[PDB]
Amino acid sequence: HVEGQKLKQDGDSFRMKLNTQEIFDDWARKVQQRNLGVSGRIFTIESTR
Amino acid sequence: RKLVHDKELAAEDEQVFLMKQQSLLAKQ
């Protein structure tokens, strides 16, 4: 039906607009950019004026 | 009778503790 074809087009647009793989890739890229590791020393003396 | 002389109970200052800590941090 014409209404069904329009609904299929809207669903394709929604699937394009609702990926979340880009969000997952951005989160992974941010984590890789961070690359953290701490607590090896007990009293990390953050002495500042 | 050995009046007083009870060792003068005292401790290092907080600034002194921080300074010894800074020396240890240099030594860390």
Coordinates of C-alpha atoms in Angstrom, one line a residue:
Chain A
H1 CA 0.0 0.0 0.0
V2 CA 1.0 3.6 -0.4
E3 CA 0.7 4.2 3.4
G4 CA 2.8 1.1 3.9
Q5 CA 5.5 2.4 1.5
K6 CA 5.5 5.7 3.3
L7 CA 5.8 3.9 6.6
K8 CA 8.7 1.9 5.2
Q9 CA 10.4 5.1 4.1
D10 CA 9.9 6.7 7.6
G11 CA 11.2 3.5 9.2
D12 CA 14.3 3.6 7.0
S13 CA 14.8 7.3 8.0
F14 CA 14.4 6.4 11.6
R15 CA 16.9 3.5 11.3
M16 CA 19.4 5.9 9.7
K17 CA 18.8 8.4 12.5
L18 CA 19.0 5.9 15.3
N19 CA 22.3 4.1 14.8
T20 CA 24.2 4.4 18.1
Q21 CA 27.3 2.8 16.5
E22 CA 28.7 6.3 16.0
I23 CA 28.1 6.9 19.8
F24 CA 29.9 3.6 20.6
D25 CA 32.8 4.5 18.3
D26 CA 33.1 8.0 19.8
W27 CA 33.1 6.6 23.4
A28 CA 35.8 4.1 22.4
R29 CA 37.9 6.9 20.7
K30 CA 37.6 9.0 23.8
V31 CA 38.7 6.1 26.0
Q32 CA 41.6 5.4 23.8
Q33 CA 42.6 9.1 23.8
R34 CA 42.4 9.1 27.6
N35 CA 44.3 5.9 28.4
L36 CA 44.5 6.2 32.1
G37 CA 46.0 4.3 35.1
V38 CA 46.6 5.6 38.6
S39 CA 46.8 4.6 42.3
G40 CA 50.3 3.0 42.1
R41 CA 51.5 5.4 44.7
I42 CA 49.6 5.7 48.0
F43 CA 49.9 9.4 48.9
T44 CA 50.0 11.2 45.6
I45 CA 51.1 14.5 47.3
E46 CA 49.2 17.1 45.3
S47 CA 50.9 20.0 47.1
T48 CA 49.9 23.4 45.6
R49 CA 50.2 27.0 46.6
Chain B
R1 CA 61.4 13.7 94.3
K2 CA 62.4 14.6 90.6
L3 CA 60.0 17.5 90.0
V4 CA 58.3 17.6 86.5
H5 CA 60.6 16.6 83.6
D6 CA 57.8 14.4 82.2
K7 CA 59.6 14.5 78.7
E8 CA 57.5 17.5 77.5
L9 CA 54.9 15.6 75.5
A10 CA 54.7 17.2 72.0
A11 CA 54.4 16.3 68.3
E12 CA 55.6 17.7 65.0
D13 CA 53.7 20.6 63.5
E14 CA 51.2 20.2 60.7
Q15 CA 53.3 22.5 58.6
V16 CA 56.3 20.4 59.8
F17 CA 54.4 17.2 58.9
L18 CA 53.7 18.7 55.4
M19 CA 57.4 19.7 55.0
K20 CA 58.7 16.3 56.0
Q21 CA 56.0 14.9 53.6
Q22 CA 57.3 17.2 50.8
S23 CA 60.8 16.0 51.5
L24 CA 59.5 12.4 51.3
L25 CA 57.7 13.3 48.0
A26 CA 61.0 14.6 46.7
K27 CA 62.4 11.2 47.9
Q28 CA 59.4 9.4 46.3

